[PDB]
Amino acid sequence: PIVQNLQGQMVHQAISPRTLNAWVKVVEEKAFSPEVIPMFSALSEGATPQDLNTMLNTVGGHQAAMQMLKETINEEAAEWDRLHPVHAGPIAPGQMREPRGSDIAGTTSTLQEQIGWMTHNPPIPVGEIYKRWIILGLNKIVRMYSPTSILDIRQGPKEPFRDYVDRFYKTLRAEQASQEVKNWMTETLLVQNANPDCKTILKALGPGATLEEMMTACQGV
Amino acid sequence: PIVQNLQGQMVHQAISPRTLNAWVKVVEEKAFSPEVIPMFSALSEGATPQDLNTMLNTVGGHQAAMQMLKETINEEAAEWDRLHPVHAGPIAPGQMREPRGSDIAGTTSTLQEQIGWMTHNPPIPVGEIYKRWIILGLNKIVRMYSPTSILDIRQGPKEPFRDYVDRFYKTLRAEQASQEVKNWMTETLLVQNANPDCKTILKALGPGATLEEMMTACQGV
Numbered sequence: 130p131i132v133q134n135l136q137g138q139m140v141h142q143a144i145s146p147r148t149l150n151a152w153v154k155v156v157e158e159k160a161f162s163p164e165v166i167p168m169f170s171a172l173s174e175g176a177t178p179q180d181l182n183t184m185l186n187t188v189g190g191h192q193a194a195m196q197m198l199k200e201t202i203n204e205e206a207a208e209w210d211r212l213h214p215v216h217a218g219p220i221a222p223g224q225m226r227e228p229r230g231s232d233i234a235g236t237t238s239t240l241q242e243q244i245g246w247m248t249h250n251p252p253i254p255v256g257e258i259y260k261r262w263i264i265l266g267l268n269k270i271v272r273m274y275s276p277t278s279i280l281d282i283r284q285g286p287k288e289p290f291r292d293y294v295d296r297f298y299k300t301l302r303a304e305q306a307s308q309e310v311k312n313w314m315t316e317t318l319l320v321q322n323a324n325p326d327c328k329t330i331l332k333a334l335g336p337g338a339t340l341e342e343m344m345t346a347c348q349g350v
Numbered sequence: 351p352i353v354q355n356l357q358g359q360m361v362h363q364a365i366s367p368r369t370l371n372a373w374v375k376v377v378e379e380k381a382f383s384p385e386v387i388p389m390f391s392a393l394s395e396g397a398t399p400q401d402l403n404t405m406l407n408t409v410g411g412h413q414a415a416m417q418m419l420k421e422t423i424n425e426e427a428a429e430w431d432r433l434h435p436v437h438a439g440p441i442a443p444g445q446m447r448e449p450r451g452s453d454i455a456g457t458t459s460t461l462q463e464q465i466g467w468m469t470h471n472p473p474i475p476v477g478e479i480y481k482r483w484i485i486l487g488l489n490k491i492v493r494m495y496s497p498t499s500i501l502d503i504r505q506g507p508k509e510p511f512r513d514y515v516d517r518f519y520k521t522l523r524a525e526q527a528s529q530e531v532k533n534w535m536t537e538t539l540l541v542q543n544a545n546p547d548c549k550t551i552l553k554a555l556g557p558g559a560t561l562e563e564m565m566t567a568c569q570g571v
């Protein structure tokens with residue numbers, strides 16, 4: 130985080146040990162359930178790339194996943210570097226050097242330049258692009274850790290409908306696809322994969338039946 | 351048919367050989383299934399009654415069918431004679447005479463007469479009336495040659511609903527009862543005769559359901 134001192138100049142503030150330990154416990158306990166992404170984005174609000182690096186390195190276990198995240202961050206940094214070629218020439222006192230692909234990731238940047246980049250007007254959000262790369266990696270990790278694809282979620286012969294819907298929507302949350310495909314999956318795959326006992330009821334209800342109506346109608350079975 | 355020559359005068363043009371060939375194929379191979387009527391009504395596009403008789407001689411091979419067709423033509427001609435009593439008196443020399451029930455049927459008329467009748471301002475259609483009588487006869491023949499009654503169209507244990515609906519509608523179009531009985535058949539007899547699973551879904555769907563919703567809800571069963 131970045132805060133203003135008494136004089137009003139921006140000063141970095143280290144993350145409290147409570148937040149850091151909460152994030153570490155979330156990563157080590159939850160495996161990589163899909164709710165880690167919102168929790169991470171809530172715990173890392175307006176943080177400098179050094180803070181993100183601390184929040185990532187501090188994790189003790191799940192080292193394979195952190196390695197995959199390292200690979201994804203490196204690929205995104207290389208692509209960004211290719212997109213922005215270096216402008217040769219001395220930097221005027223009124224500006225600062227343009228951050229390269231690895232300057233964003235914090236492997237070759239000091240704290241002061243990172244503070245200066247996004248506190249400048251107009252701002253260049255190093256933190257908000259680094260967090261985008263990290264979240265893009267976490268999406269792949271979460272998708273990998275989820276057991277089964279959405280197309281293989283099937284209600285058992287005896288399973289209650291509420292548990293089946295819970296499994297289906299957990300898997301769909303873990304799924305990686307655009308929003309339109311997710312809407313189609315919600316509309317059709319839910320009815321299509323049900324057990325024979327509830328499939329007839331769901332078809333008889335109609336094509337525009339809301340989730341509440343389906344679950345209250347299939348409550349007994 | 352009727353065409354305009356190089357001098358702007360309407361002149362009869364004979365039916366091309368392959369159109370008569372197509373009609374002969376329709377008569378001899380379709381076994382008077384309910385689709386003979388649309389194909390006749392297509393092949394006889396704007397034909398003077400001489401061409402209608404030329405196409406009709408093909409049915410002369412079937413003794414019973416031609417007898418039914420001739421009886422219906424004669425009955426409609428008698429009704430036409432009754433409803434249009436011949437007026438005795440002088441007529442404007444710029445107008446043609448009046449077509450008798452045996453002159454709209456091309457039995458006692460010449461080609462120039464029918465050309466003048468059809469190419470008139472306002473036109474007096476003889477081809478269309480003759481075609482309507484022929485279609486009445488063909489409706490009677492198609493009804494006679496039906497293979498099964500509407501009450502015997504029952505979906506099989508595993509026949510898809512689409513095939514059953516197509517069979518049912520073909521049989522209903524052959525039998526051609528009145529309109530209200532047709533609506534009652536479509537609404538109720540269609541649901542009644544279905545196989546147990548589709549019957550269950552259709553009953554649970556509700557009463558007064560359009561065909562689209564029935565076929566959409568009963569798609570994969």
Ligand SMILES: O=P(O)(O)O[C@H]1[C@H](OP(=O)(O)O)[C@@H](OP(=O)(O)O)[C@H](OP(=O)(O)O)[C@@H](OP(=O)(O)O)[C@H]1OP(=O)(O)O
Nearest residue numbers: 351352353363364365366367368369370371372392393395
């Ligand atoms: O009554 P037909 O002698 O068999 O005439 C047909 C007819 O031509 P017209 O109606 O212009 O006389 C076809 O026209 P369609 O209405 O089917 O389109 C045409 O076929 P094209 O459409 O391909 O022109 C075909 O011509 P073709 O011989 O090139 O197949 C031609 O048959 P004839 O040429 O033997 O008269």
